[PDB]
From a paper:
AdeJ, the trimeric inner membrane component of the tripartite system, is responsible for drug recognition and proton motive force (PMF) generation that provides the cellular energy required for substrate transport. The bacterial ribosome represents a major target for antimicrobial agents, as it is vital for protein synthesis and is one of the largest molecular machines in the cell. Eravacycline (Era), a fully synthetic fluorocycline containing the tetracyclic core scaffold with modifications in the tetracyclic D ring, shows enhanced broad-spectrum antibacterial activity in comparison to previous generations of tetracycline-based antibiotics. Our data indicate that the AdeJ pump primarily uses hydrophobic interactions to bind eravacycline, while the 70S ribosome utilizes electrostatic interactions to bind this drug.
The structure of the small 30S subunit core was solved to a resolution of 2.80 Å, but the resolution of its head group reached 2.71 Å. Notably, the Era-binding site overlaps with the previously reported tetracycline-binding site in the 30S subunit. This suggests that this specific binding region can accommodate a wide range of tetracycline-based molecules. Our structural data agree with this mechanism where Era is observed to specifically interact with 30S, and this Era-binding site also overlaps with the familiar tigecycline-binding site previously found in the A. baumannii 70S ribosome.
Author numbering:
A (entry chain u): 2 to 64
B (entry chain o): 2 to 88
C (entry chain k): 12 to 128
D (entry chain f): 1 to 104
E (entry chain r): 21 to 72
Write the structure that this text describes.
Amino acid sequence: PQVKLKEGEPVDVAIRRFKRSCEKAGVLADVRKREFYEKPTQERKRKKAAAVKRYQKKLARES
Amino acid sequence: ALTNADRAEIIAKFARAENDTGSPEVQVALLTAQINDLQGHFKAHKHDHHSRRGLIRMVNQRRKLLDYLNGKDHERYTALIGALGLR
Amino acid sequence: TRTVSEGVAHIHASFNNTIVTITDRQGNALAWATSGGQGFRGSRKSTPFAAQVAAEVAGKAALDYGLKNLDVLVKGPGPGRESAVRALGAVGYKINSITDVTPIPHNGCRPPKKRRV
Amino acid sequence: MRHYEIVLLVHPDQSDQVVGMVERYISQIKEADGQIHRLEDWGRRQLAYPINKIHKAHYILMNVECGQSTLDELEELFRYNDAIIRNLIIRREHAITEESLLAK
Amino acid sequence: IDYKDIDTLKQYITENGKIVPSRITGTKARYQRQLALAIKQARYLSLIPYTD
RNA sequence: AGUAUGGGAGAGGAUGGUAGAAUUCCAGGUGUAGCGGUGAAAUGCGUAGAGAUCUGGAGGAAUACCGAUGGCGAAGGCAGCCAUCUGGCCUAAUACUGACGCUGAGGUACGAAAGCAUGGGGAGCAAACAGGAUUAGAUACCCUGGUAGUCCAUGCCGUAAACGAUGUCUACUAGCCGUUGGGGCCUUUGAGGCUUUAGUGGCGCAGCUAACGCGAUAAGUAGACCGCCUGGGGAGUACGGUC
Ligand SMILES: [Mg+2]
Ligand SMILES: [Mg+2]
Ligand SMILES: [Mg+2]
Ligand SMILES: [Mg+2]
Ligand SMILES: [Mg+2]
Ligand SMILES: [Mg+2]
Ligand SMILES: [Mg+2]
Ligand SMILES: [Mg+2]
Ligand SMILES: [Mg+2]
Ligand SMILES: [Mg+2]
Ligand SMILES: [Mg+2]
Ligand SMILES: [Mg+2]
């Protein structure tokens, strides 16, 4: 955040910069997650799947 | 709590040979010292179930060592139990 | 009556609705408007077009007090975050900065249950 | 006995008292026996966030070799004192005595 | 890694004030654990901010 | 198999304290209309003035980022920071006792969540329950409220797809690639490369298997002790007994 505007900065470029800053921050993902409750078993399963996928990606890259 | 000094005193008192640390008597004396020490803590914290397993392990080890000593030598076992007032 | 040199814009963006509030620094609200306030009764309340229209109508009222420099705080995940800022730029206000203010709990209260449908 | 590190914040208004404050505390430790290894005055500093509607505070660091009862007394005195705003007690193995960063 | 050396700690905080994962920095796990502990202590001592 | 002496890692356990983020409620300042929610609506909340915004308080519960085929624990399971009490594990070298061991019928200890007894607490969520919807019907799915419960202290209960669907202990049998905690060696421009241990993962020869697959963390080759099964229902139910 805190995207200050230059003297001649067009509004569109500032909007794009704010979009990029928000995307880098990742706040939207947390806000989406907070909507509903994830039970411990479901989150453990999701993390296991994510780890397996990451390891597969690393092995594919190394090849 | 028991410091290195107390342990050294116990070992010296029950040592049989010079530099002896592994004889049954020394091990039983050290275990008895620790078991007696832990009584105050377990009186203070009665729901610490995780450390009572270690306490029970010490008790079982003492029982095994005493049974071994009795089988090896009866007089030594009697003297050890008399000194420690165990049973 | 009051003359305010600089102002702040608040965007309560939601899936259902988008609310625009205009305030002056140190607090106090000068004017406000929402999608449902000017038509858009129903699902259109969520459309970004309603968001930009609401922002424009709010800005038009805000001009009455007299101000030329604005700051934007976007607080919500709803569609209309870009629409409101575009409208505020179009109406002629100078935006000093645009920031995000959406809250985040550090494991606070339990969120509601998931919707099975 | 045990080596502790104590970093404590005090209010600017009572700043003139700090010179006395530390002194008395040291005396109490020296009453039992103790040892005072480090004592650094970082000075007034702006806070990263307002503590009790206060934007600046004076930080002071101490390193001691004290007993349990003295530590408890120090904790109680810190808590009941109104001048100081928040303290931190960290047990340290061995004593560190050298020019500490952020000294000046 | 101690709470005192605020500069090194700042060399790993993010603009929002969050800790950066080891995957980006490339640091060792033990170093990361002490790094996070020092950040939390300094954050408690109002030397670095909790958030932005 | 065990003991003494130096070090190291860790959400292991018990007690107390304390920090920041957020939700709800309360009081106040600006301000005037709606807000909220759904696929769409409606119930509901609001001109004794809501929603939005700012300030100051109350209370309960849980610890974003770090966070990871990561860590610790016998299993159940353990996540902010600080102190006290305390269990186990890894690692180096010496010095000790000298088979002191393994398993284990009965027995005994601990044991998720739900539920029970007494006394507290109650933010959020939420069985039952009351309304609004959809439908042919709606005892549900969806929406608005909401009680027990979820939290604490002292006890009881002893059950889970309590799962790796794989009892414990011991010796041996190609290799390759990761990662966590240590030991040793070789370079150096201060971080890398090799080995050795104890964990934790992905492939894979021989061997085994009905097949799928397992494969030094065996479901391979052997030994010691225990538990269990004998077609599908009836039934983990009837009678007796213990709790
Ligand atoms: Mg056994
Ligand atoms: Mg049995
Ligand atoms: Mg019981
Ligand atoms: Mg409901
Ligand atoms: Mg308790
Ligand atoms: Mg069963
Ligand atoms: Mg389980
Ligand atoms: Mg399983
Ligand atoms: Mg089974
Ligand atoms: Mg086998
Ligand atoms: Mg039959
Ligand atoms: Mg029965």
